[PDB]
Amino acid sequence: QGMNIKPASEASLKDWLELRNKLWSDSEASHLQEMHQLLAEKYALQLLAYSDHQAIAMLEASIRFEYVNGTETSPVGFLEGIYVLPAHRRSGVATMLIRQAEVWAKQFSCTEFASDAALDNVISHAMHRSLGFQETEKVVYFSKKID
């Protein structure tokens, strides 16, 4: 319908920032430096969706060559994050973005698209299932300093 999706760019950095920061909180300067890197990374995809003149959603994805939990192939496409403004969550925009993300990943001859979500974000689990993802594994991460 009345929506369009385009890759993010320098012209749309402000739009992308607003949405990105609602998903992952950080300083503008930190987000912005990261976003410029992503623009120059061929294995990253960053899409915005518009309704009228308004940015309403964003998707970020990557191509992962390192092992991803739950997958059977490598490389795979990987959903790094998706955010749709609350008032626009009944528009199928998230489906439209994932579809375009899959077309992108196919260029790399990927056959699987993987993703993850925080264990307690059960709403996001429901959203993944609506987008056609099936749960593979639940895991707990650990870390330690060596230096």
Helix (H, G, I), strand (E, B) or coil at 80: strand
SS3 101: helix
Candidate residues 66, 137, 144, 146; the one interacting with ligand TOY per rule CB under 6 A: 137
**67 vs 87 by CB, closer to its own copies:** 67
Enter the tokens of residue 74. 């490598």
Q: How far is the CB of 107 from Cl ion (least distance, A)?
A: 27
Q: How many residues bind its own copies (CB under 8 A)?
A: 48
113 binds its own copies (CB under 8 A): yes
Q: What CA–CA distances, in Å, run from 66 to 46, 61, 81, 135?
A: 20, 15, 18, 19
Tell me how far, at minimum, the Cβ of 40 lies from K ion, in Å: 7
Report the residue number, 91 or 105, with the smaller CB distance to K ion. Answer: 105
Cα 28 from Cα 38, distance rounded (Å): 15
Element (H, E) at 45: strand 44-51
What's the closest the beta carbon of residue 11 comes to its own copies, in angstroms?
Answer: 26
Q: Token pair of 29, please?
A: 């300067």
Residues that bind its own copies (CB under 8 A): 62, 64-72, 76-77, 79-80, 102, 105-106, 109-120, 125, 128, 131-147
